[PDB]
Ligand SMILES: O=C(O)CCC(=O)C(=O)O
Ligand SMILES: O=C(O)CCC(=O)C(=O)O
């Protein structure tokens with residue numbers, strides 16, 4: 001593989017890449033750059049790549065160990081890959097800013113989304129840079145946040161009252177809650193590789209900053225959750241059938257619009273595991 | 282005779298008995314009165330039927346007094362302002378504020394005397410800037426210490442409320458010119474005790490200049506609420522002839538406007554203060 005065409009969709013986050021057939025493995029000249037592409041633009045987009053779960057699970061394992069979701073349905077015979085089929089009976093639930101599975105000791109470092117069945121229009125998906133948003137913070141503020149820890153809870157994005165349709169569904173929730181208690185993650189996170197600083201909190205799971213008072217936390221989080229929706233921090237993608245999206249889950253957050261029902265939307269996703277989030281001067 | 286100092290709480294306010302403010306106080310009495318004001322930030326003395334003069338004489342022992350260019354004053358004592366509120370001059374102090382912080386040298390304190398009062402209502406409350414600051418977590422203390430905030434005249438006196446007649450629209454424009462926005466420490470070090478205290482008030486503070494606009498809005502939103510917490514306050518129910526002495530350097534106060542159509546008359550002495558500063 002000679003090289004790849006990387007087109008930045010913005011100065012901070014965004015990149016549309018081509019010249020990379022994702023149905024068949026790739027060399028080591030290609031991976032490096034594609035790897036460093038996602039590690040550079042935080043989230044890259046590759047089009048026209050009609051690949052099946054196994055193919056998706058394949059590449060995802062090239063980045064690292066994959067993670068299995070405790071409540072979301074998986075594709076047939078393919079646990080590793082979770083399926084997001086949405087309709088009137090199964091409303092969308094990712095229309096909130098979040099960072100995939102930060103409720104575990106070592107949150108996923110990346111993920112690969114793939115469009116299967118898309119509605120006529122809608123279902124756009126956004127990503128926001130945790131590193132930009134940090135840079136946008138005044139010095140006095142970085143000093144404040146850096147060093148503080150914030151709790152993450154599975155229940156915040158998955159409440160019991162939302163998993164009682166059946167007794168099975170309820171049982172699965174109870175188990176998932178059990179294996180995932182609330183735990184701490186730095187407000188400011190140092191990227192394992194780059195070493196760049198980034199805001200590591202997200203509305204989907206962060207319940208509170210334990211290092212300050214309850215109301216100081218409400219006020220700080222109330223600011224951070226708004227701060228990250230600033231346009232200049234994000235890239236927006238309009239989906240098209242058979243499309244690939246790979247992003248770094250250590251320094252970003254995404255949001256998936258809910259505006260296509262009663263139509264049906266089907267997405268497949270691979271979830272690469274990562275290390276222990278941390279902070280360092 | 283030592284004065285009786287009864288604290289009204291663990292952080293702020295106290296009621297003092299044993300002092301006859303109608304006559305000069307001995308060194309021993311003024312000193313324990315002075316020190317009680319620094320300690321409790323706001324003290325109250327009841328049954329003190331004094332004259333403006335006698336009030337001025339007491340205020341002059343705390344520092345220079347202000348002669349107000351507008352507000353009317355007592356019989357023949359320019360230093361004693363008359364705050365006469367009723368239906369044709371409604372109360373306008375029912376908001377948390379620190380007096381005239383929009384000038385380089387906000388008053389160091391004041392002496393308020395209740396001349397005439399509504400049958401009920403008119404309660405005035407003070408909130409402790411010291412207790413509020415110390416109730417912050419170490420990370421907020423280090424954040425707010427050293428930051429500066431803008432204090433604007435126009436935040437308490439908005440242009441949209443002075444547009445009726447084009448007359449009181451230019452005298453507004455004029456006021457706004459004689460009092461431009463200026464800065465103060467977000468955390469003020471008391472000139473005497475060296476105690477640190479939050480020094481913003483929503484009557485005049487418009488924003489922290491040392492951080493972003495949004496960050497400022499979030500911080501102030503928090504601080505304007507944090508200081509209204511019950512634990513940091515003392516509430517006073519007035520009685521005719523009450524005297525209240527407070528340290529405007531580290532507190533804020535709020536006067537309830539819930540007694541019209543009844544009439545309320547207070548006499549006030551304003552004590553000029555020095556420059557507000559922060560020193561670690
Ligand atoms: O449906 C999408 O486009 C994204 C869904 C999502 O938030 C995820 O897979 O983590
Ligand atoms: O009327 C009062 O009791 C207090 C009014 C006031 O805010 C002041 O004198 O500064």
Ligand SMILES: [Fe+2]
Nearest residue numbers: 094098100254
């Ligand atoms: Fe997601």
Ligand SMILES: [Fe+2]
Nearest residue numbers: 374379380534
């Ligand atoms: Fe006042």
